[PDB]
Symmetry: D2
Subunit: 115 residues, 4 copies
Protein backbone atom coordinates (compact mmCIF):
# COMPACT_ATOMS: atom_id res chain seq x y z
CA UNK A 1 0.00 0.00 0.00
CA UNK A 2 1.98 2.94 -1.35
CA UNK A 3 -0.48 5.68 -0.30
CA UNK A 4 -2.05 6.08 3.15
CA UNK A 5 -3.96 9.05 4.49
CA UNK A 6 -4.32 9.90 8.21
CA UNK A 7 -6.54 12.55 9.70
CA UNK A 8 -6.50 13.92 13.29
CA UNK A 9 -8.89 16.18 15.18
CA UNK A 10 -7.08 18.99 17.11
CA UNK A 11 -10.28 20.04 18.97
CA UNK A 12 -11.14 16.63 20.46
CA UNK A 13 -7.60 15.27 20.47
CA UNK A 14 -8.61 12.15 18.60
CA UNK A 15 -8.39 10.51 15.23
CA UNK A 16 -10.84 12.05 12.79
CA UNK A 17 -13.23 9.21 12.00
CA UNK A 18 -15.37 8.71 8.89
CA UNK A 19 -13.74 11.54 7.04
CA UNK A 20 -14.27 11.36 3.25
CA UNK A 21 -11.04 11.48 1.19
CA UNK A 22 -10.89 11.91 -2.62
CA UNK A 23 -7.70 11.42 -4.65
CA UNK A 24 -7.38 12.87 -8.17
CA UNK A 25 -4.62 12.54 -10.74
CA UNK A 26 -3.78 15.13 -13.41
CA UNK A 27 -4.57 13.75 -16.88
CA UNK A 28 -3.04 14.54 -20.29
CA UNK A 29 -5.59 17.35 -20.86
CA UNK A 30 -4.49 19.07 -17.60
CA UNK A 31 -7.81 18.12 -15.90
CA UNK A 32 -8.23 16.36 -12.53
CA UNK A 33 -9.33 12.79 -13.07
CA UNK A 34 -10.75 10.76 -10.18
CA UNK A 35 -8.15 8.28 -8.91
CA UNK A 36 -9.38 6.79 -5.66
CA UNK A 37 -11.49 7.59 -2.58
CA UNK A 38 -12.40 6.28 0.82
CA UNK A 39 -13.23 7.10 4.41
CA UNK A 40 -10.93 7.11 7.45
CA UNK A 41 -11.34 4.31 10.01
CA UNK A 42 -11.72 4.42 13.79
CA UNK A 43 -7.92 5.03 13.85
CA UNK A 44 -8.24 8.08 11.53
CA UNK A 45 -6.44 6.09 8.83
CA UNK A 46 -7.30 5.24 5.25
CA UNK A 47 -5.42 2.35 3.71
CA UNK A 48 -6.09 0.51 0.46
CA UNK A 49 -6.68 3.58 -1.69
CA UNK A 50 -4.38 2.13 -4.35
CA UNK A 51 -1.85 -0.53 -5.36
CA UNK A 52 1.73 -0.26 -6.50
CA UNK A 53 0.52 -1.14 -10.02
CA UNK A 54 -2.07 1.62 -10.24
CA UNK A 55 -0.11 4.31 -8.37
CA UNK A 56 2.04 5.48 -11.26
CA UNK A 57 4.09 8.73 -11.65
CA UNK A 58 1.90 11.79 -11.85
CA UNK A 59 0.56 14.84 -10.11
CA UNK A 60 -1.97 13.87 -7.44
CA UNK A 61 -4.43 15.85 -5.35
CA UNK A 62 -5.67 14.47 -2.01
CA UNK A 63 -8.84 16.22 -0.96
CA UNK A 64 -9.90 15.73 2.60
CA UNK A 65 -13.53 16.64 3.12
CA UNK A 66 -13.04 18.62 6.31
CA UNK A 67 -16.22 20.76 6.02
CA UNK A 68 -18.51 17.68 6.04
CA UNK A 69 -16.61 16.36 9.08
CA UNK A 70 -16.91 19.59 11.14
CA UNK A 71 -20.56 20.03 10.05
CA UNK A 72 -21.34 16.49 11.29
CA UNK A 73 -19.94 17.62 14.66
CA UNK A 74 -22.22 20.71 14.68
CA UNK A 75 -19.32 23.03 13.85
CA UNK A 76 -19.31 25.60 11.03
CA UNK A 77 -15.69 25.63 9.79
CA UNK A 78 -13.69 27.94 7.53
CA UNK A 79 -12.39 25.58 4.81
CA UNK A 80 -14.37 23.59 2.25
CA UNK A 81 -11.68 20.89 2.49
CA UNK A 82 -7.96 20.41 2.95
CA UNK A 83 -6.03 19.75 -0.32
CA UNK A 84 -2.61 18.26 -0.72
CA UNK A 85 -1.13 18.49 -4.25
CA UNK A 86 2.14 16.70 -5.04
CA UNK A 87 4.15 14.89 -7.74
CA UNK A 88 4.57 11.20 -6.91
CA UNK A 89 7.09 8.56 -7.94
CA UNK A 90 9.02 11.15 -9.92
CA UNK A 91 12.25 9.57 -8.66
CA UNK A 92 11.24 5.87 -8.35
CA UNK A 93 8.34 4.24 -6.39
CA UNK A 94 7.96 5.22 -2.73
CA UNK A 95 5.41 4.86 0.03
CA UNK A 96 3.55 8.07 0.90
CA UNK A 97 1.73 8.83 4.16
CA UNK A 98 -0.22 12.08 3.91
CA UNK A 99 -1.42 13.32 7.32
CA UNK A 100 -3.74 16.27 8.14
CA UNK A 101 -4.36 17.79 11.54
CA UNK A 102 -7.69 19.62 11.61
CA UNK A 103 -9.12 22.62 13.45
CA UNK A 104 -12.22 24.66 12.54
CA UNK A 105 -10.16 27.59 11.10
CA UNK A 106 -6.86 25.86 10.38
CA UNK A 107 -5.16 22.71 9.18
CA UNK A 108 -1.62 21.38 9.04
CA UNK A 109 -0.59 18.69 6.59
CA UNK A 110 2.69 16.75 6.30
CA UNK A 111 4.04 13.93 4.13
CA UNK A 112 6.21 11.03 5.28
CA UNK A 113 7.85 9.42 2.21
CA UNK A 114 9.78 6.22 2.75
CA UNK A 115 11.65 3.99 0.34
CA UNK B 1 -8.45 45.22 2.43
CA UNK B 2 -11.10 42.47 2.78
CA UNK B 3 -8.51 39.79 1.80
CA UNK B 4 -4.85 39.54 2.76
CA UNK B 5 -2.44 36.61 2.29
CA UNK B 6 0.66 36.14 4.41
CA UNK B 7 3.34 33.44 3.90
CA UNK B 8 6.08 32.40 6.35
CA UNK B 9 9.16 30.14 5.89
CA UNK B 10 9.63 27.58 8.74
CA UNK B 11 13.13 26.62 7.50
CA UNK B 12 14.70 30.08 7.33
CA UNK B 13 12.52 31.64 10.09
CA UNK B 14 11.57 34.53 7.87
CA UNK B 15 8.72 35.91 5.78
CA UNK B 16 8.44 34.04 2.47
CA UNK B 17 9.29 36.76 0.01
CA UNK B 18 8.29 36.94 -3.67
CA UNK B 19 5.96 33.96 -3.43
CA UNK B 20 3.33 33.81 -6.24
CA UNK B 21 -0.28 33.65 -4.98
CA UNK B 22 -3.29 32.94 -7.19
CA UNK B 23 -6.88 33.41 -6.01
CA UNK B 24 -9.87 31.88 -7.89
CA UNK B 25 -13.59 32.20 -7.44
CA UNK B 26 -16.03 29.39 -8.22
CA UNK B 27 -18.32 30.38 -11.10
CA UNK B 28 -21.99 29.35 -11.60
CA UNK B 29 -20.78 26.84 -14.26
CA UNK B 30 -19.00 25.06 -11.36
CA UNK B 31 -15.50 26.00 -12.63
CA UNK B 32 -12.67 28.01 -11.09
CA UNK B 33 -12.15 31.48 -12.53
CA UNK B 34 -9.05 33.68 -11.92
CA UNK B 35 -10.03 36.35 -9.40
CA UNK B 36 -6.78 37.97 -8.08
CA UNK B 37 -3.07 37.31 -7.80
CA UNK B 38 0.29 38.77 -6.92
CA UNK B 39 3.59 38.12 -5.18
CA UNK B 40 4.30 38.48 -1.46
CA UNK B 41 6.33 41.53 -0.35
CA UNK B 42 9.46 41.65 1.86
CA UNK B 43 7.12 41.21 4.83
CA UNK B 44 5.68 38.01 3.31
CA UNK B 45 2.37 39.81 2.80
CA UNK B 46 0.19 40.34 -0.21
CA UNK B 47 -2.19 43.30 0.07
CA UNK B 48 -4.43 44.93 -2.56
CA UNK B 49 -5.71 41.60 -3.88
CA UNK B 50 -9.28 42.84 -4.04
CA UNK B 51 -11.76 45.49 -2.90
CA UNK B 52 -14.92 45.33 -0.81
CA UNK B 53 -16.99 45.78 -4.03
CA UNK B 54 -15.41 42.84 -5.79
CA UNK B 55 -15.15 40.48 -2.81
CA UNK B 56 -18.64 39.02 -2.69
CA UNK B 57 -19.87 35.85 -0.98
CA UNK B 58 -18.88 32.75 -2.85
CA UNK B 59 -16.34 29.93 -2.84
CA UNK B 60 -12.68 30.95 -3.21
CA UNK B 61 -9.42 29.08 -3.72
CA UNK B 62 -6.05 30.52 -2.76
CA UNK B 63 -3.06 28.72 -4.29
CA UNK B 64 0.31 29.57 -2.85
CA UNK B 65 3.08 28.57 -5.23
CA UNK B 66 5.27 26.79 -2.72
CA UNK B 67 7.20 24.53 -5.13
CA UNK B 68 8.67 27.56 -6.99
CA UNK B 69 9.54 29.25 -3.71
CA UNK B 70 11.56 26.23 -2.48
CA UNK B 71 13.15 25.76 -5.93
CA UNK B 72 14.43 29.35 -5.75
CA UNK B 73 16.12 28.62 -2.40
CA UNK B 74 17.63 25.30 -3.64
CA UNK B 75 15.57 23.22 -1.19
CA UNK B 76 13.76 20.03 -2.25
CA UNK B 77 9.97 20.41 -1.92
CA UNK B 78 7.08 17.99 -1.76
CA UNK B 79 3.93 20.00 -2.63
CA UNK B 80 3.10 21.55 -6.01
CA UNK B 81 1.42 24.35 -4.01
CA UNK B 82 -0.50 25.00 -0.79
CA UNK B 83 -4.25 25.43 -1.37
CA UNK B 84 -6.82 27.01 0.85
CA UNK B 85 -10.47 26.61 -0.30
CA UNK B 86 -13.10 28.48 1.71
CA UNK B 87 -16.58 30.08 1.54
CA UNK B 88 -16.76 33.83 2.06
CA UNK B 89 -19.91 34.66 4.08
CA UNK B 90 -21.26 38.11 4.95
CA UNK B 91 -21.89 38.48 8.70
CA UNK B 92 -21.15 42.09 9.51
CA UNK B 93 -17.86 43.72 8.49
CA UNK B 94 -15.17 41.03 7.93
CA UNK B 95 -11.52 41.04 6.86
CA UNK B 96 -10.01 37.68 5.98
CA UNK B 97 -6.32 37.03 6.50
CA UNK B 98 -5.12 33.70 5.11
CA UNK B 99 -1.72 32.74 6.48
CA UNK B 100 0.49 29.82 5.49
CA UNK B 101 3.59 28.52 7.23
CA UNK B 102 5.78 26.53 4.86
CA UNK B 103 8.21 23.64 5.26
CA UNK B 104 9.52 21.50 2.43
CA UNK B 105 7.25 18.56 3.28
CA UNK B 106 4.57 20.26 5.34
CA UNK B 107 2.41 23.34 5.61
CA UNK B 108 0.05 24.88 8.18
CA UNK B 109 -2.64 27.33 7.10
CA UNK B 110 -4.99 29.38 9.26
CA UNK B 111 -7.63 31.99 8.66
CA UNK B 112 -8.06 34.97 10.90
CA UNK B 113 -11.38 36.71 10.37
CA UNK B 114 -11.76 40.07 12.14
CA UNK B 115 -14.39 42.87 12.46
CA UNK C 1 10.93 46.00 19.66
CA UNK C 2 13.53 43.19 19.62
CA UNK C 3 10.89 40.68 20.89
CA UNK C 4 7.23 40.39 19.97
CA UNK C 5 4.77 37.57 20.76
CA UNK C 6 1.65 36.92 18.70
CA UNK C 7 -1.07 34.35 19.50
CA UNK C 8 -3.83 33.09 17.18
CA UNK C 9 -6.94 30.95 17.88
CA UNK C 10 -7.46 28.09 15.33
CA UNK C 11 -10.98 27.34 16.67
CA UNK C 12 -12.49 30.82 16.45
CA UNK C 13 -10.29 32.03 13.54
CA UNK C 14 -9.28 35.13 15.42
CA UNK C 15 -6.41 36.68 17.35
CA UNK C 16 -6.15 35.19 20.84
CA UNK C 17 -6.95 38.17 22.99
CA UNK C 18 -5.95 38.75 26.63
CA UNK C 19 -3.67 35.72 26.72
CA UNK C 20 -1.04 35.84 29.53
CA UNK C 21 2.57 35.47 28.31
CA UNK C 22 5.57 34.96 30.58
CA UNK C 23 9.16 35.23 29.36
CA UNK C 24 12.12 33.87 31.40
CA UNK C 25 15.85 34.07 30.92
CA UNK C 26 18.24 31.32 32.01
CA UNK C 27 20.55 32.58 34.76
CA UNK C 28 24.20 31.55 35.38
CA UNK C 29 22.95 29.38 38.30
CA UNK C 30 21.13 27.31 35.61
CA UNK C 31 17.66 28.45 36.77
CA UNK C 32 14.86 30.33 35.01
CA UNK C 33 14.40 33.94 36.06
CA UNK C 34 11.34 36.11 35.21
CA UNK C 35 12.36 38.48 32.41
CA UNK C 36 9.14 39.99 30.91
CA UNK C 37 5.42 39.38 30.70
CA UNK C 38 2.08 40.79 29.67
CA UNK C 39 -1.23 40.01 28.01
CA UNK C 40 -1.94 39.96 24.27
CA UNK C 41 -3.91 42.91 22.82
CA UNK C 42 -7.04 42.84 20.62
CA UNK C 43 -4.71 42.02 17.72
CA UNK C 44 -3.33 38.99 19.58
CA UNK C 45 0.02 40.78 19.89
CA UNK C 46 2.20 41.60 22.82
CA UNK C 47 4.64 44.47 22.22
CA UNK C 48 6.90 46.34 24.66
CA UNK C 49 8.13 43.16 26.33
CA UNK C 50 11.72 44.34 26.36
CA UNK C 51 14.25 46.81 24.93
CA UNK C 52 17.40 46.36 22.88
CA UNK C 53 19.48 47.13 26.04
CA UNK C 54 17.85 44.43 28.10
CA UNK C 55 17.55 41.76 25.41
CA UNK C 56 21.01 40.24 25.45
CA UNK C 57 22.19 36.87 24.10
CA UNK C 58 21.15 34.02 26.31
CA UNK C 59 18.55 31.26 26.61
CA UNK C 60 14.91 32.37 26.86
CA UNK C 61 11.62 30.64 27.57
CA UNK C 62 8.28 32.01 26.45
CA UNK C 63 5.26 30.44 28.17
CA UNK C 64 1.90 31.19 26.63
CA UNK C 65 -0.89 30.51 29.11
CA UNK C 66 -3.11 28.50 26.81
CA UNK C 67 -5.07 26.55 29.45
CA UNK C 68 -6.49 29.80 30.96
CA UNK C 69 -7.34 31.13 27.51
CA UNK C 70 -9.41 28.03 26.62
CA UNK C 71 -11.00 27.97 30.11
CA UNK C 72 -12.22 31.55 29.53
CA UNK C 73 -13.92 30.48 26.28
CA UNK C 74 -15.49 27.34 27.88
CA UNK C 75 -13.47 24.97 25.67
CA UNK C 76 -11.71 21.88 27.09
CA UNK C 77 -7.92 22.16 26.72
CA UNK C 78 -5.07 19.68 26.83
CA UNK C 79 -1.89 21.72 27.48
CA UNK C 80 -1.02 23.62 30.66
CA UNK C 81 0.70 26.15 28.37
CA UNK C 82 2.63 26.41 25.09
CA UNK C 83 6.38 26.83 25.63
CA UNK C 84 8.98 28.12 23.25
CA UNK C 85 12.62 27.78 24.44
CA UNK C 86 15.29 29.37 22.24
CA UNK C 87 18.79 30.92 22.24
CA UNK C 88 19.04 34.59 21.30
CA UNK C 89 22.20 35.13 19.20
CA UNK C 90 23.61 38.43 17.96
CA UNK C 91 24.24 38.38 14.20
CA UNK C 92 23.56 41.89 12.99
CA UNK C 93 20.31 43.68 13.82
CA UNK C 94 17.57 41.12 14.67
CA UNK C 95 13.92 41.31 15.73
CA UNK C 96 12.35 38.09 16.98
CA UNK C 97 8.65 37.46 16.52
CA UNK C 98 7.40 34.32 18.28
CA UNK C 99 3.98 33.28 17.02
CA UNK C 100 1.71 30.52 18.32
CA UNK C 101 -1.41 29.09 16.73
CA UNK C 102 -3.63 27.42 19.31
CA UNK C 103 -6.11 24.55 19.22
CA UNK C 104 -7.45 22.75 22.28
CA UNK C 105 -5.24 19.70 21.75
CA UNK C 106 -2.53 21.11 19.52
CA UNK C 107 -0.32 24.10 18.92
CA UNK C 108 2.07 25.31 16.20
CA UNK C 109 4.80 27.82 17.00
CA UNK C 110 7.18 29.57 14.63
CA UNK C 111 9.87 32.19 14.94
CA UNK C 112 10.35 34.89 12.38
CA UNK C 113 13.70 36.62 12.72
CA UNK C 114 14.14 39.76 10.59
CA UNK C 115 16.82 42.45 9.96
CA UNK D 1 1.69 1.49 27.08
CA UNK D 2 -0.24 4.59 28.09
CA UNK D 3 2.27 7.16 26.75
CA UNK D 4 3.84 7.15 23.27
CA UNK D 5 5.80 9.92 21.62
CA UNK D 6 6.18 10.34 17.83
CA UNK D 7 8.44 12.77 16.05
CA UNK D 8 8.42 13.74 12.33
CA UNK D 9 10.85 15.73 10.21
CA UNK D 10 9.08 18.34 7.98
CA UNK D 11 12.30 19.12 6.02
CA UNK D 12 13.10 15.55 4.91
CA UNK D 13 9.54 14.26 5.05
CA UNK D 14 10.49 11.35 7.26
CA UNK D 15 10.25 10.10 10.78
CA UNK D 16 12.72 11.86 13.04
CA UNK D 17 15.06 9.08 14.14
CA UNK D 18 17.20 8.89 17.29
CA UNK D 19 15.62 11.94 18.82
CA UNK D 20 16.16 12.17 22.61
CA UNK D 21 12.93 12.57 24.63
CA UNK D 22 12.79 13.42 28.37
CA UNK D 23 9.59 13.22 30.44
CA UNK D 24 9.30 15.05 33.78
CA UNK D 25 6.54 15.06 36.37
CA UNK D 26 5.74 17.93 38.73
CA UNK D 27 6.52 16.93 42.34
CA UNK D 28 5.00 18.13 45.64
CA UNK D 29 7.60 20.94 45.90
CA UNK D 30 6.53 22.31 42.46
CA UNK D 31 9.84 21.12 40.88
CA UNK D 32 10.22 18.98 37.73
CA UNK D 33 11.26 15.48 38.66
CA UNK D 34 12.63 13.11 36.02
CA UNK D 35 9.99 10.56 35.02
CA UNK D 36 11.19 8.69 31.96
CA UNK D 37 13.32 9.11 28.81
CA UNK D 38 14.20 7.43 25.58
CA UNK D 39 15.03 7.82 21.92
CA UNK D 40 12.73 7.54 18.90
CA UNK D 41 13.10 4.46 16.66
CA UNK D 42 13.47 4.15 12.89
CA UNK D 43 9.68 4.82 12.76
CA UNK D 44 10.06 8.09 14.73
CA UNK D 45 8.22 6.45 17.63
CA UNK D 46 9.07 5.99 21.29
CA UNK D 47 7.15 3.32 23.13
CA UNK D 48 7.79 1.84 26.57
CA UNK D 49 8.44 5.12 28.37
CA UNK D 50 6.11 4.01 31.17
CA UNK D 51 3.53 1.52 32.47
CA UNK D 52 -0.04 1.98 33.56
CA UNK D 53 1.16 1.47 37.16
CA UNK D 54 3.80 4.19 37.08
CA UNK D 55 1.88 6.70 34.92
CA UNK D 56 -0.24 8.22 37.66
CA UNK D 57 -2.24 11.53 37.69
CA UNK D 58 0.00 14.55 37.55
CA UNK D 59 1.40 17.37 35.48
CA UNK D 60 3.91 16.05 32.94
CA UNK D 61 6.40 17.75 30.65
CA UNK D 62 7.61 15.99 27.48
CA UNK D 63 10.81 17.56 26.25
CA UNK D 64 11.86 16.65 22.77
CA UNK D 65 15.51 17.44 22.15
CA UNK D 66 15.05 19.06 18.76
CA UNK D 67 18.26 21.17 18.82
CA UNK D 68 20.50 18.06 19.13
CA UNK D 69 18.57 16.45 16.26
CA UNK D 70 18.93 19.43 13.85
CA UNK D 71 22.59 19.92 14.89
CA UNK D 72 23.30 16.25 14.05
CA UNK D 73 21.92 17.03 10.58
CA UNK D 74 24.25 20.06 10.22
CA UNK D 75 21.40 22.50 10.79
CA UNK D 76 21.44 25.37 13.30
CA UNK D 77 17.82 25.60 14.53
CA UNK D 78 15.86 28.18 16.52
CA UNK D 79 14.52 26.16 19.47
CA UNK D 80 16.47 24.43 22.24
CA UNK D 81 13.73 21.76 22.30
CA UNK D 82 10.00 21.30 21.89
CA UNK D 83 8.07 21.04 25.21
CA UNK D 84 4.62 19.66 25.77
CA UNK D 85 3.15 20.31 29.26
CA UNK D 86 -0.15 18.67 30.24
CA UNK D 87 -2.19 17.21 33.11
CA UNK D 88 -2.68 13.46 32.70
CA UNK D 89 -5.24 10.99 34.02
CA UNK D 90 -7.12 13.82 35.70
CA UNK D 91 -10.38 12.17 34.61
CA UNK D 92 -9.43 8.44 34.71
CA UNK D 93 -6.57 6.56 32.95
CA UNK D 94 -6.17 7.11 29.21
CA UNK D 95 -3.63 6.41 26.50
CA UNK D 96 -1.72 9.47 25.28
CA UNK D 97 0.11 9.83 21.97
CA UNK D 98 2.12 13.06 21.85
CA UNK D 99 3.33 13.89 18.33
CA UNK D 100 5.71 16.69 17.19
CA UNK D 101 6.35 17.82 13.64
CA UNK D 102 9.72 19.56 13.38
CA UNK D 103 11.19 22.31 11.22
CA UNK D 104 14.33 24.39 11.90
CA UNK D 105 12.32 27.50 13.01
CA UNK D 106 8.99 25.92 13.91
CA UNK D 107 7.24 22.95 15.45
CA UNK D 108 3.67 21.71 15.73
CA UNK D 109 2.60 19.32 18.46
CA UNK D 110 -0.71 17.48 18.96
CA UNK D 111 -2.11 14.94 21.43
CA UNK D 112 -4.33 11.97 20.60
CA UNK D 113 -6.00 10.74 23.83
CA UNK D 114 -7.98 7.53 23.64
CA UNK D 115 -9.89 5.62 26.29
C1 LIG E 1 -5.69 40.57 13.70
O1 LIG E 1 -4.72 39.53 13.52
C2 LIG E 1 -4.14 39.19 12.21
O2 LIG E 1 -4.38 39.91 11.25
C3 LIG E 1 -3.27 37.96 12.05
C4 LIG E 1 -2.63 37.80 10.66
N1 LIG E 1 -1.43 37.00 10.91
C5 LIG E 1 -1.35 35.66 10.97
O3 LIG E 1 -2.38 34.98 10.84
C6 LIG E 1 -0.02 34.98 11.32
C7 LIG E 1 -0.02 33.58 11.41
C8 LIG E 1 1.13 32.87 11.76
C9 LIG E 1 1.10 31.46 11.83
C10 LIG E 1 0.58 30.69 10.76
C11 LIG E 1 0.55 29.29 10.82
C12 LIG E 1 1.02 28.61 11.94
F1 LIG E 1 0.99 27.26 12.00
C13 LIG E 1 1.53 29.35 13.00
C14 LIG E 1 1.57 30.76 12.95
F2 LIG E 1 2.07 31.42 14.00
C15 LIG E 1 2.31 33.60 12.04
C16 LIG E 1 2.35 35.00 11.98
I1 LIG E 1 4.17 36.03 12.43
C17 LIG E 1 1.17 35.67 11.62
O4 LIG E 1 1.21 37.04 11.57
C1 LIG F 1 7.16 6.36 9.81
O1 LIG F 1 6.25 7.34 10.33
C2 LIG F 1 4.93 7.51 9.75
O2 LIG F 1 4.40 6.56 9.18
C3 LIG F 1 4.22 8.84 9.85
C4 LIG F 1 2.71 8.78 9.62
N1 LIG F 1 2.15 9.71 10.61
C5 LIG F 1 2.09 11.05 10.62
O3 LIG F 1 2.58 11.68 9.66
C6 LIG F 1 1.46 11.66 11.92
C7 LIG F 1 1.46 13.12 11.81
C8 LIG F 1 0.96 13.93 12.84
C9 LIG F 1 0.97 15.37 12.72
C10 LIG F 1 0.40 16.03 11.62
C11 LIG F 1 0.40 17.44 11.52
C12 LIG F 1 0.95 18.22 12.54
F1 LIG F 1 0.95 19.56 12.48
C13 LIG F 1 1.49 17.58 13.65
C14 LIG F 1 1.50 16.18 13.72
F2 LIG F 1 2.05 15.64 14.81
C15 LIG F 1 0.50 13.20 13.95
C16 LIG F 1 0.48 11.75 14.11
I1 LIG F 1 -0.30 10.96 15.90
C17 LIG F 1 0.90 10.78 13.11
O4 LIG F 1 1.00 9.55 13.07
Amino acid sequence: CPLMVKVLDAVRGSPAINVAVHVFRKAADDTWEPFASGKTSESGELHGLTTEEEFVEGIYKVEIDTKSYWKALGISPFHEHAEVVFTANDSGPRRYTIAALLSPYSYSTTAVVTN
